[PDB]
Write a protein that binds this ligand. Sequence first.
Ligand SMILES: O=P(O)(O)O[C@H]1[C@H](OP(=O)(O)O)[C@@H](OP(=O)(O)O)[C@H](OP(=O)(O)O)[C@@H](OP(=O)(O)O)[C@H]1OP(=O)(O)O
Ligand SMILES: O=P(O)(O)O[C@H]1[C@H](OP(=O)(O)O)[C@@H](OP(=O)(O)O)[C@H](OP(=O)(O)O)[C@@H](OP(=O)(O)O)[C@H]1OP(=O)(O)O
Ligand SMILES: [Zn+2]
Ligand SMILES: [Zn+2]
Lengths: 396, 397
Amino acid sequence: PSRQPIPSEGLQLHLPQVLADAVSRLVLGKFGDLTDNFSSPHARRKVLAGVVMTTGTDVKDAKVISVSTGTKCINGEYMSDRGLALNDCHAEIISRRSLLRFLYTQLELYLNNKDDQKRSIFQKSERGGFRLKENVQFHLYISTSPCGDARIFSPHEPILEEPADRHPNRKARGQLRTKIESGQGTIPVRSNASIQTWDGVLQGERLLTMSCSDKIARWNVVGIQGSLLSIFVEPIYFSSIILGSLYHGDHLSRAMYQRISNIEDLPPLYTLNKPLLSGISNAEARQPGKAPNFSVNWTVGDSAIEVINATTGKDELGRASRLCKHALYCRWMRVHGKVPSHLLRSKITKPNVYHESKLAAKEYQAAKARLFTAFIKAGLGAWVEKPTEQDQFSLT
Amino acid sequence: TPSRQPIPSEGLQLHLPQVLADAVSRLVLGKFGDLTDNFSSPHARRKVLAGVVMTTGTDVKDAKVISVSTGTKCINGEYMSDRGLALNDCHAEIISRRSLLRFLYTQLELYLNNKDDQKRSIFQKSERGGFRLKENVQFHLYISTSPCGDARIFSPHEPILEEPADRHPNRKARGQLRTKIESGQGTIPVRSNASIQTWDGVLQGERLLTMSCSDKIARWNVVGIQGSLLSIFVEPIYFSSIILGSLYHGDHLSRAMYQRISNIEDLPPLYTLNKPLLSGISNAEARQPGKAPNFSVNWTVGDSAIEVINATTGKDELGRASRLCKHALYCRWMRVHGKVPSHLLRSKITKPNVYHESKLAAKEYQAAKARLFTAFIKAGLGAWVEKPTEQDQFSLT
RNA sequence: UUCCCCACAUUGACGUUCAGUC
RNA sequence: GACUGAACGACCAAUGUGGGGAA
Ligand SMILES: O=P(O)(O)O[C@H]1[C@H](OP(=O)(O)O)[C@@H](OP(=O)(O)O)[C@H](OP(=O)(O)O)[C@@H](OP(=O)(O)O)[C@H]1OP(=O)(O)O
Ligand SMILES: O=P(O)(O)O[C@H]1[C@H](OP(=O)(O)O)[C@@H](OP(=O)(O)O)[C@H](OP(=O)(O)O)[C@@H](OP(=O)(O)O)[C@H]1OP(=O)(O)O
Ligand SMILES: [Zn+2]
Ligand SMILES: [Zn+2]
C-alpha cells in the first residue's frame, strides 16, 4: 500500500502513472539532450530534478520547463550581501528557481506586444494582475525523495505492498528540519531555536538551510512563484510531485501537506495545495561515485546549461548565477517598469532594496505567516530564516 | 589585495606593524598553549581566542603577555545577579579587557606597596594628579577573529565597494550599533524604535541586549580601556594596536573601531578618538564551522591556572563568582582606595558605598561616555543600550 | 502505541594517500 | 595553484533497528 500513487483533486484529468512516467522520461531525456547523451563533463549527478508544463490532456503536449542537478548548500564564508550567490543547490530548489526565470520570460512575452499575448501562458485577471490560462499545469520531478520529513525515515526503497510507517506517531514525524553546514542528516529546528546571525555564521556557527521537504510544503501553501512575482501574478501551484526513487506515500503526503492540515485564515487565492503524489514505474538506480561539488541548471529557451559551484554559489570563474537573488531582482525590476500600474496585484510602492520590495507582496507575506503558525501550533517547530542582512541590497 | 593590508596607527609607532602583529599573535597563542597543557586540555576548546600584550620599548622582545581568554557567548537574562556576581559578557575580547583591569589594579598595589617597587611598577605619579603610565608602555589587543558587530558585517569573498566619496546616490548607513542576541554568538542591529530594558522584565525572559564587541571596542577607543572606576586613580589608557587572526578588512575594521564616530566633539582633557594600529596576521586562521564551547576561559599574568566560566550563567560550573565580575573588581578597587592617600585621587569620591555611585564619581569618564553616545546618535547609528540601573546597586562585605 | 536505556546501523564537511585535467 | 576522480581514516546530530525496561 505504501508504494502507491496518492491522487490529487475531486475530478481526474490525467492517468496518475502515465503522467508520472511521462514527466520522468521527459526530464531525464532533456537532461540527456543537454549533456550529449550523459557523456558531458557535467553529466555526473547524484540527484536530478525538473519541472514539466502541461497545456492539455494530449500527453504529447508536454514541455520540459527546467532541469537541474545538485546536492549541496553554500559554505558560510561565501554568503553574499549583494545577493550574488546561490544559497541552496539541492536540485529541486534549483529547478523551482529556473521555473521563476521561465515565468518572468512569459510575463515579458505578454507585455511585449499584442500578437505575443496569445502565446504567453498568462492572461489578465478580473481581480487585477495576471493568472495562468485555464489549462496550464506544472509538475515537479525529483529523482529521489526531498530531504527532511519525506526522506529521513526510510532512506531505502520499500518492499512493495508493504504497510506504512510502523511508528507513525513519534514526535519526530512531521518535524521541520534543516540541512546543517558541515554535518550530515537534516535536523529538527526545535533544537536550534535561536535566529541566525551574519557575524555568527561568518565566525563559524553552522549555517542552517530549511530541508527540501519543508520548502516544498511551503510551496504547497504560498505558491511556487514567490513574493516578487506574486506582485504581478496570482498564486501558482504544482499539480504533481513525482519521485524517481525512494517513494513512500505515507511519508511524502505527511511531509507535503498533511502535517499542516490545521492551517487557517489563508488570504484570498491561497490554499493548502494537495498535488498528485507518485513514484514511477521503473525507479532510478543509485548514481555511483562521489557527489559532485557542482550544480547544473537549465531553463527552456536557454542555449547552454549553467554550472555552479554549490560550495560558493557562483560559477567556476566566480561570476553570479542567472538564478541568484540579484538576477531575479533585475528581471523583476524590468517587468515592473513595463507593467501599467493599474495591473499590479499589489500597488504598494516601496524603496528599491530587495527585502522592502518583497514586503510589498502583503498577501504573500500573510500566507507565509499562516504557514509558520501552522507548523508551530502543530508542534513541528519554528521556521529558520537567513540572517536579515542577506536581503538588504539594491541594484547598485 | 588592498583589503588585506595593515592600517598604521595615529599613536606612537614604536614597532613595525607586521613584526608587531606576528609577535603578539604568536605570544598569545603560545601562552594559551602553556596554560592548557599544550592544547590537549578540555578547556583548550574554543571558537575565539583573545589576549593582551604589553610592550615597554622599541625592542619587540620586551613584550609580556598580560592576559588570555576565550569565549563567544553572553549571559542568559534570566541568570543575572543583583549583587553583581555574574559576568554579563564572555566574548573573548571583553574578558581580556577585564583581565587587564586586574593587572592594572595589581600594578597600583605594586607602586603603593613601598618605595622600591615604584621603579618596577608600570605607573608613575602624574603632574596633573593621580597616576599615569610610564613614558613607553603600550598595550596591544589580539582577537583570533574580527570582533562581532559592525566589524564582521561583510562578505569576505566579495570585493569592498562600500562608500563612494560623493554622497550615496542611494543612502547611509554602514556602522549601525548592534546587540548580541541572547543564546547567540551573533548580533543584530539596534531598533530605531528603541524600548529600554527593565530588570524584572528581562529576568522574566524578555530579550537581554548586550552591545556588540565592535561597539564596545569603539567605546574603548574613546573612553579608554580602564573604565570609570580606575579612571579615578589613573589617566585614560588606550590600546595602541588591534591585531586580528581572521576576517581582517582594513576598510570595515577602520570604520568600526573609530571612523564611524569621527564626528565626536568636546571630549574632556586627556581623552581622544584613539586610532590604533589595525592589522591582520601572516598566516590567518581558517573558519572552523562547528559547535561553540559554552564556556569562557580567562587568565591574568601572575595567576597559576586559568579560570573557567559558564557563559550562560556568568559564573563557574559550581556556581562561584568569577575573579572578573563587578563585585570582584569592586573588591580590588576598594583595597586600592584604602592604600591611596586622598590628595592623590584624580576625582573625589569620599564614602564609597554602592557600586554605581562610585562609577558616577568618575565625572570626566562619564562626560566622555556622554559625548560617545551623542556621537553615535548624530551619526545616525542608533542609541547605545545600557543595563537597567538595578544591576549596579550593590555594596561590599 | 509512546517514551527510556543500551548496543548496532544509516545519512554534509575534514584529513591522509594515489592518479588525472587546465 | 585550481579543478577532478579512486582508496583510506576521523568527524558531524539526527534517524532506523534490535535486546532490555516504563507509562
Ligand atoms: O528556497 P530558495 O530558492 O533557496 O530561496 C528562498 C527564497 O529567497 P529568494 O527567492 O529571494 O532567493 C525565499 O523568498 P520568497 O520568494 O519566498 O519571499 C526566502 O524567503 P524570505 O523572503 O521569507 O526570506 C528564503 O529564505 P529564508 O531562508 O529566509 O526562508 C530562500 O531560501 P534560502 O534562504 O534557504 O535560499
Ligand atoms: O566588560 P563589559 O561587559 O563591557 O562591562 C561594562 C562595564 O561595566 P563593569 O566594569 O561594571 O563590568 C561598563 O562600566 P564602565 O567601567 O565603563 O563604567 C558598563 O557601563 P556603565 O557602568 O558606564 O553603564 C557596561 O554596562 P552597560 O550595559 O550599562 O553599558 C558594561 O557592559 P555589559 O553591561 O555589557 O557588561
Ligand atoms: Zn534536499
Ligand atoms: Zn563579540
